[PDB]
Design an enzyme around this catalytic site. Sequence first.
Site, PDB file in Angstrom:
ATOM      1  N   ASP A  36      -3.254  -2.329 -13.515  1.00 51.17           N
ATOM      2  CA  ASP A  36      -3.587  -1.479 -12.294  1.00 51.17           C
ATOM      3  C   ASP A  36      -3.714  -2.116 -11.399  1.00 51.17           C
ATOM      4  O   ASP A  36      -4.710  -2.650 -11.000  1.00 51.17           O
ATOM      5  CB  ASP A  36      -4.560  -0.187 -12.731  1.00 51.17           C
ATOM      6  N   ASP A 221       1.155  -0.039  -6.091  1.00 46.70           N
ATOM      7  CA  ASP A 221      -0.074   0.426  -7.199  1.00 46.70           C
ATOM      8  C   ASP A 221       0.597   0.785  -8.584  1.00 46.70           C
ATOM      9  O   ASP A 221       1.299   1.666  -8.677  1.00 46.70           O
ATOM     10  CB  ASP A 221      -0.635   1.727  -6.509  1.00 46.70           C
TER      11      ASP A 221
HETATM   12  N1  LIG Z   1      -4.269   3.107  -9.421  1.00 45.63           N
HETATM   13  C1  LIG Z   1      -5.374   3.834  -9.657  1.00 45.63           C
HETATM   14  N2  LIG Z   1      -6.233   3.361 -10.686  1.00 45.63           N
HETATM   15  C2  LIG Z   1      -6.958   4.439 -10.570  1.00 45.63           C
HETATM   16  C3  LIG Z   1      -8.207   4.628 -11.306  1.00 45.63           C
HETATM   17  C4  LIG Z   1      -9.154   5.321 -11.252  1.00 45.63           C
HETATM   18 CL1  LIG Z   1     -10.554   5.491 -12.053  1.00 45.63          CL
HETATM   19  C5  LIG Z   1      -9.130   6.288 -10.141  1.00 45.63           C
HETATM   20  C6  LIG Z   1      -7.837   6.191  -9.245  1.00 45.63           C
HETATM   21  C7  LIG Z   1      -7.182   5.334  -9.592  1.00 45.63           C
HETATM   22  N3  LIG Z   1      -5.941   4.816  -8.935  1.00 45.63           N
HETATM   23  C8  LIG Z   1      -5.357   5.369  -7.645  1.00 45.63           C
HETATM   24  C9  LIG Z   1      -5.359   4.562  -6.504  1.00 45.63           C
HETATM   25  C10 LIG Z   1      -3.986   4.602  -5.549  1.00 45.63           C
HETATM   26  O1  LIG Z   1      -4.188   6.264  -5.025  1.00 45.63           O
END
Ligand SMILES: Nc1nc2cc(Cl)ccc2n1CCCO
Length: 373
Positions: A36, A221
Amino acid sequence: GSFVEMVDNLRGKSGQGYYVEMTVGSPPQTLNILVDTGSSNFAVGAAPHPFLHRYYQRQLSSTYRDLRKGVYVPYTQGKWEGELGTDLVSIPHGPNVTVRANIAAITESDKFFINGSNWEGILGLAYAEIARPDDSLEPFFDSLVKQTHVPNLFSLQLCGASVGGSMIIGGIDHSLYTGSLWYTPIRREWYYEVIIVRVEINGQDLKMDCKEYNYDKSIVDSGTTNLRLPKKVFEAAVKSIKAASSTEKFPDGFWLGEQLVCWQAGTTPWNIFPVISLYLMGEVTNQSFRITILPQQYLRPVEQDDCYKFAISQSSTGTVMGAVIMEGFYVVFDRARKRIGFAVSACHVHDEFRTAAVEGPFVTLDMEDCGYN
Ligand SMILES: Nc1nc2cc(Cl)ccc2n1CCCO
């Protein structure tokens, strides 16, 4: 060079993210961890959950150290909640190193773990600024680079079609891209924030104030499935996509990403759908380059027929170049040089007559004005 032990170290389910194998603890406990780039915590299931099939058992690790601090990570759909600690971490199909890293042992969660995703944790590869509970919790990649000789760079080839790909840590594998890597500056080290300077749909300029493209940010992302676009941009984009694909009409719901569209196996009319080009700020003054993705990227295959969801969606938190963007490209997160590189993926899904593309340079003036503050 080549990084053959790291090539093909990612797997996933369509729309449920790409994961890599990691071991935590002494002796090593294997877990599948979401890759991520949109987050900065290394967090693992550490207690039973209906959708978890294995989890981190801290009491079984001799090298586990309890940081005696909770972390709570609420977000849009739900939350995860856990206990901070450190332990020894490795990536079996990664560099041959072991590093002590912060680990959030997830104890409570809501709509975080996805049924049938086969991952049990998340590896946030973005910067400390967006780490939880605060930026003093050093992210895994920071620790990795600091504790080893691994260069401050990783690269992701996300192939889409069950999904697979590669995370090359500490390098760039030339077997995974064709043509040139073009770099865009990381505007600010928190998310991997970039600046989009122009957007075209089949060559037709969306023709908006370029700030609109980056309102309130644009980020790369891997943990987001879709290309997400600020409301204004999404509407204009969908309008243009509809116009370009107009030889076939699809329901309102398809364009909201709700309904599937299906075609007889092998007859998906890719060619009626337009390509989408994002021009990114270049590293040279007044220079941009463009990345071009196909409908094979933005029409996500979903389970007789070949069925698809529209994987472009509206955002209120800026542009997210998610797996839809990334699956066209070999993407280099060159942290050492505060830039992100794009090249055409040697594995991207395309047809006989069109390919994803990365092209440049383009004279583009006043590109800083495209950044939103
Ligand atoms: N990629 C990503 N991993 C995440 C993990 C969490 Cl717990 C919340 C939002 C997340 N996002 C979204 C960020 C981009 O809008």
